[PDB]
Ligand binder design. Sequence first.
Ligand code: SF4
Ligand code: SF4
Lengths: 85, 85
Amino acid sequence: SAPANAVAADDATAIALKYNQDATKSERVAAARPGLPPEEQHCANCQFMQADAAGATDEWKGCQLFPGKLINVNGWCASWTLKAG
Amino acid sequence: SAPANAVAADDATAIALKYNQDATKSERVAAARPGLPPEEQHCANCQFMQADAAGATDEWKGCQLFPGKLINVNGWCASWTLKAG
Ligand code: SF4
Ligand code: SF4
């Protein structure tokens, strides 16, 4: 089961930022954010994902943009940015 | 007159996010978002602010949560998080 502090689907920030815990159901094709084809975009390779968040698991990680919460590594939002060198 | 796409108080996203174009009149103290003293928080030091948005001025700048629109640099909403990276 999801952590209790998972980002909720209809959290107001999640709504505004176009977060979806399943990237395949997200607006990523429409958004056309640069750096990878949309089909390759998800939280796991994002700049803002925080691997060392409290309560992180292989599936659930922090995000700079959702303080105190956990996103799904297979998620996406409109701030997706490939983590660069 | 302000940019045509300045965020209005009756914008539906604004209401959901608890945006106020005057941070001093916002809920920022009670909300106590982490990362800076709440009384110092406003759009100008927020991670979501986009200073190079089309139509921006020294007063009106972009926000990732209000695509296509301009917030006030002195504003605040409950999604505030410190600009960082
Ligand atoms: S900023 Fe990155 S890690 Fe955070 S929810 Fe959006 S895509 Fe996922
Ligand atoms: S997310 Fe940040 S920049 Fe956007 S309205 Fe809220 S406080 Fe202002």
